[PDB]
Amino acid sequence: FVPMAFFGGSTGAIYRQFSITIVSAMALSVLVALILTPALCATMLK
Amino acid sequence: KVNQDGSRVLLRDVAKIELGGENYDIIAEFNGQPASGLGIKLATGANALDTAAAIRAELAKMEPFFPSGLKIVYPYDTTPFVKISIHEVVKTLVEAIILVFLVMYLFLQNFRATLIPTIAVPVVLLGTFAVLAAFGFSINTLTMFGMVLAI
Amino acid sequence: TAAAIRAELAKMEPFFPSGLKIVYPYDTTPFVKISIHEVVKTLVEAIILV
Amino acid sequence: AYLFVRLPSSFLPDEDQGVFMTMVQLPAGATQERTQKVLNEVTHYYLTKEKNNVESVFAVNGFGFAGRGQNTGIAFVSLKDWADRPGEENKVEAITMRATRAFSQIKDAMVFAFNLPAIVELGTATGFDFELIDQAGLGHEKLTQARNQLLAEAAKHPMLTSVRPNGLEDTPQFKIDIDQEKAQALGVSINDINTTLGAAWGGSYVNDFIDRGRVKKVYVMSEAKYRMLPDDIGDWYVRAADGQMVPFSAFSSSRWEYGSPRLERYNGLPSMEILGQAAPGKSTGEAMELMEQLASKLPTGVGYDWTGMSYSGNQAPSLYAISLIVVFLCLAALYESWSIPFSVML
Amino acid sequence: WGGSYVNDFIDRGRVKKVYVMSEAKYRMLPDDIGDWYVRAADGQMVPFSA
Amino acid sequence: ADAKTVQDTVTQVIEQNMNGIDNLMYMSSNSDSTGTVQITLTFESGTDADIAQVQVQNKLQLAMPLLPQEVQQQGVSVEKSSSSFLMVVGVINTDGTMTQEDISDYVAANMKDAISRTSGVGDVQLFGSQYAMRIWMNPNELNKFQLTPV
Amino acid sequence: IAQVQVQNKLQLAMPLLPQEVQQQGVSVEKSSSSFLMVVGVINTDGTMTQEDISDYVAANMKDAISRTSGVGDVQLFGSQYAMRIWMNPNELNKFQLTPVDVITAIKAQNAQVAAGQLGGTPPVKGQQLNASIIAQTRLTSTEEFGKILL
Numbered sequence: 026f027v028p029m030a031f032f033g034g035s036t037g038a039i040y041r042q043f044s045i046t047i048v049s050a051m052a053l054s055v056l057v058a059l060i061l062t063p064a065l066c067a068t069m070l071k
Numbered sequence: 072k073v074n075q076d077g078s079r080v081l082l083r084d085v086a087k088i089e090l091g092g093e094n095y096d097i098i099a100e101f102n103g104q105p106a107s108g109l110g111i112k113l114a115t116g117a118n119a120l121d122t123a124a125a126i127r128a129e130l131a132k133m134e135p136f137f138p139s140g141l142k143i144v145y146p147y148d149t150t151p152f153v154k155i156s157i158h159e160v161v162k163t164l165v166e167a168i169i170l171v172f173l174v175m176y177l178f179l180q181n182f183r184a185t186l187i188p189t190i191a192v193p194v195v196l197l198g199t200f201a202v203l204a205a206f207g208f209s210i211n212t213l214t215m216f217g218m219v220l221a222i
Numbered sequence: 223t224a225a226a227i228r229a230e231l232a233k234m235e236p237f238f239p240s241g242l243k244i245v246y247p248y249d250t251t252p253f254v255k256i257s258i259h260e261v262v263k264t265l266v267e268a269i270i271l272v
Numbered sequence: 273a274y275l276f277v278r279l280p281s282s283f284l285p286d287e288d289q290g291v292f293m294t295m296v297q298l299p300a301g302a303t304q305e306r307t308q309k310v311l312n313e314v315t316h317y318y319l320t321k322e323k324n325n326v327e328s329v330f331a332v333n334g335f336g337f338a339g340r341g342q343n344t345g346i347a348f349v350s351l352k353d354w355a356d357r358p359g360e361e362n363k364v365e366a367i368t369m370r371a372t373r374a375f376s377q378i379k380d381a382m383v384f385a386f387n388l389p390a391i392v393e394l395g396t397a398t399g400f401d402f403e404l405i406d407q408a409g410l411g412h413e414k415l416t417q418a419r420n421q422l423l424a425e426a427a428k429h430p431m432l433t434s435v436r437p438n439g440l441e442d443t444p445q446f447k448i449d450i451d452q453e454k455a456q457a458l459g460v461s462i463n464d465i466n467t468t469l470g471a472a473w474g475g476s477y478v479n480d481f482i483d484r485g486r487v488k489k490v491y492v493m494s495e496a497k498y499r500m501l502p503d504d505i506g507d508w509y510v511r512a513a514d515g516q517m518v519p520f521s522a523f524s525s526s527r528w529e530y531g532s533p534r535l536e537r538y539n540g541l542p543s544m545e546i547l548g549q550a551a552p553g554k555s556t557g558e559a560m561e562l563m564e565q566l567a568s569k570l571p572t573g574v575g576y577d578w579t580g581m582s583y584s585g586n587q588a589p590s591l592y593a594i595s596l597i598v599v600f601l602c603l604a605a606l607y608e609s610w611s612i613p614f615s616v617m618l
Numbered sequence: 619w620g621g622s623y624v625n626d627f628i629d630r631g632r633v634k635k636v637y638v639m640s641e642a643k644y645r646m647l648p649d650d651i652g653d654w655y656v657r658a659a660d661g662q663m664v665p666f667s668a
Numbered sequence: 669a670d671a672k673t674v675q676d677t678v679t680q681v682i683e684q685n686m687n688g689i690d691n692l693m694y695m696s697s698n699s700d701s702t703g704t705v706q707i708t709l710t711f712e713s714g715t716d717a718d719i720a721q722v723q724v725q726n727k728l729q730l731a732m733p734l735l736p737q738e739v740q741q742q743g744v745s746v747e748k749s750s751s752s753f754l755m756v757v758g759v760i761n762t763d764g765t766m767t768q769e770d771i772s773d774y775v776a777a778n779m780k781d782a783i784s785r786t787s788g789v790g791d792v793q794l795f796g797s798q799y800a801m802r803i804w805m806n807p808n809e810l811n812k813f814q815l816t817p818v
Numbered sequence: 819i820a821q822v823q824v825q826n827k828l829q830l831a832m833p834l835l836p837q838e839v840q841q842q843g844v845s846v847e848k849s850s851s852s853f854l855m856v857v858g859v860i861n862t863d864g865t866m867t868q869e870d871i872s873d874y875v876a877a878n879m880k881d882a883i884s885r886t887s888g889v890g891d892v893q894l895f896g897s898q899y900a901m902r903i904w905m906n907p908n909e910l911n912k913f914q915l916t917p918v919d920v921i922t923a924i925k926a927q928n929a930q931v932a933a934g935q936l937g938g939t940p941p942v943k944g945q946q947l948n949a950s951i952i953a954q955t956r957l958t959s960t961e962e963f964g965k966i967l968l
């Protein structure tokens with residue numbers, strides 16, 4: 026995602042936003058899957 | 072001019088004087104009925120929907136002072152498409168939430184276990200809103216399809 | 223800016239009348255280029271010598 | 273690879289916005305009344321044959337997107353909401369289709385309808401925007417001839433193309449020759465003559481006046497009935513030095529000439545715009561490159577340049593190329609093997 | 619003696635200026651002041667040195 | 669004024685006096701026989717549009733005294749461009765019937781002046797025209813009394 | 819913006835300048851005490867004077883080069899062409915004429931006049947013809963300036 030995020034021409038914010046949105050979502054999903062999701066997978070699961 | 076016999080030459084006498092249009096080049100007809108309106112051109116790097124909402128704002132405080140008959144009409148508008156875009160996208164988001172809840176249920180028998188992924192991704196979604204805002208972005212047609220696709 | 227000067231000036235040469243020819247006195251470019259060249263060269267020489 | 277190559281390329285899908293529009297172009301020197309007639313026809317096509325879709329029209333006479341004048345006309349069309357338009361035939365595409373098909377039939381002018389290319393008109397691909405520049409000191413007429421030559425050679429061997437000008441029709445004009453000698457003889461000032469003519473036929477900004485608090489303008493022109501035909505030139509008389517009126521046709525001289533109503537220029541130089549679309553078979557760059565060698569067959573002094581449009585994607589090769597590097601490198605940061613980064617790659 | 623910017627005129631498409639001054643030979647020396655005459659109200663020319 | 673006139677009495681004077689402006693793609697000009705020239709300068713994407721407006725609007729200032737006084741007292745404008753509108757607030761009448769020449773004026777004398785100022789609106793296009801003291805000279809009545817437009 | 823704060827305070831002083839200066843060149847630029855590129859232009863085959871070369875560079879090159887890539891301030895070595903009229907004091911006086919008469923004759927006989935159009939802006943109904951009128955057009959050739967009536 027991040028390499029193709031390197032936009033260009035009039036297709037700038039196009040591929041840009043369409044990438045970095047999902048990249049941000051990715052890093053956040055990962056942190057959540059390393060903080061929130063594990064803790065909830067603990068606590069109460071079974 | 073005042074002629075030799077003392078007769079005056081008024082402008083009225085040499086020219087038809089009427090309170091007329093400054094320009095007779097263009098004429099607008101709304102549904103065959105004579106009319107005139109405001110064709111607002113956007114500014115480069117403007118806020119779009121904010122600008123339109125504020126157009127409605129400034130135009131709102133004129134309606135009470137209008138003369139008899141003077142009525143507003145709205146042809147060529149962009150707002151409902153934006154609103155319905157947001158609507159039809161968020162709707163898809165929710166549909167994906169429920170449809171992932173059902174798959175999470177028709178695989179994990181436990182009702183308490185199928186809550187975790189249902190709780191996880193709304194958090195992840197909101198964080199993205201915080202990031203895009205902190206990066207200078209906004210709710211866009213690409214930054215919503217991006218959300219739905221990233222789900 | 224200079225490279226783009228050469229750029230805008232490039233699309234005029236074919237339409238010139240007979241005799242109209244270009245010449246380049248007082249230029250800065252070759253000094254910049256030769257600066258980069260003679261510096262990078264020194265870098266490589268330092269790499270080998272080390 | 274085969275399913276990838278034979279996949280036609282696009283930028284962003286054009287879609288129903290519930291609001292579209294249609295333009296009308298009358299021939300050379302047409303009048304407000306005629307274009308008003310055509311506008312009536314269009315408007316009420318939208319009013320009688322498409323009631324289940326059209327909510328309201330907003331026709332405008334005298335204002336087009338090409339420019340101003342009595343030749344152009346515009347029509348903003350707002351359709352009923354998406355719910356009340358169930359079928360695909362009620363979507364903007366089909367509506368504009370049948371509309372254009374009807375207009376192309378029952379009109380003696382040029383009327384088109386067009387779905388709003390979502391976002392600003394910038395970027396379409398599979399088409400171009402060519403610009404023919406007059407580099408030397410050639411006249412407007414020579415440039416026009418060169419333009420005709422390009423537009424002829426392009427359509428001579430269309431692996432095709434579809435090329436047209438931008439709207440420079442070049443309409444006949446009415447040249448008036450004011451003989452300075454006769455004027456100086458009869459005793460009429462050239463100033464007076466000129467301002468009488470200009471004020472009478474084109475009006476003039478005189479002064480400002482207050483109307484209900486708001487300052488507005490004061491224009492003096494003339495009654496329409498004394499300026500519709502060339503013979504009306506004679507109706508105007510000018511005071512001379514000896515205090516005697518003078519027929520305009522005395523010092524005057526008139527003849528019909530040929531000129532353009534729209535003078536285009538590209539970058540400080542006289543230019544004429546060619547709008548054309550690429551081949552149905554070939555692509556954009558192929559058409560452009562196979563148009564430049566056509567433009568390079570024009571007389572000396574005539575050059576070319578590309579503007580808006582012609583100025584997937586070109587970045588995609590390099591962008592995926594970087595995506596070909598960061599991937600392998602990220603397949604090592606947690607996975608050390610020189611075998612794993614060859615596993616997922618397939 | 620110093621010329622003056624009068625009007626503009628079209629030359630090969632490009633608008634250029636119109637300057638009126640005088641032939642050089644009638645403005646190189648101080649004595650050339652006398653060569654210039656001015657129309658008076660009575661329609662008679664007047665020596666500048668007057 | 670005609671196309672030939674405006675193309676080299678307003679257009680070229682502005683164009684030639686339009687140089688030394690940062691980040692400029694191209695300058696395309698249309699000279700309309702309606703007597704209306706519209707010069708467009710395109711700037712490289714992502715540029716400071718606010719200052720880009722300035723560099724042009726202020727180089728125009730150095731060409732204004734070289735324009736005909738007919739144009740100087742007429743409208744000269746420097747704006748941010750958007751090739752298409754968004755809102756088109758049409759105004760009509762029902763009860764107290766007023767002409768399309770009245771409506772245009774009223775919109776241009778209570779609405780347009782404010783709407784064009786509100787929330788960074790780029791360039792309001794008015795469909796019609798504000799009122800004006802219109803004086804229609806009669807050639808015969810002028811000549812019969814021995815009078816010119818002047 | 820530093821360019822702006824100056825260029826715009828100049829604007830508040832322009833009407834206090836002589837009209838000779840106002841119609842002359844007033845400029846506000848970014849300064850660099852030295853050049854970098856000095857593209858000299860010469861001739862070989864078809865010999866043209868140094869007064870011709872200067873003009874051609876100032877009529878095909880300078881106008882564009884000054885606009886390209888944020889070029890600060892192009893200094894031209896020579897000058898663009900101009901209709902040059904060299905008055906003869908004797909021939910003026912012998913015919914009883916002053917420079918003022920010459921200037922007036924030029925400003926009156928060499929200009930472009932704005933005339934309206936057949937089938938004007940508000941027409942009489944049923945009008946089938948709309949065409950623009952062309953009055954006096956600006957002179958072109960030297961010979962045309964030769965035949966100015968004094």
Ligand SMILES: CC(=O)NC[C@H]1CN(c2ccc(N3CCOCC3)c(F)c2)C(=O)O1
Pocket residue numbers: 205206207
């Ligand atoms: C209307 C307008 O102009 N808004 C300006 C934006 C720009 N921006 C911002 C934030 C982080 C970054 N960074 C953070 C560190 O480097 C990467 C991006 C950035 F470049 C820019 C911000 O806060 O407001």
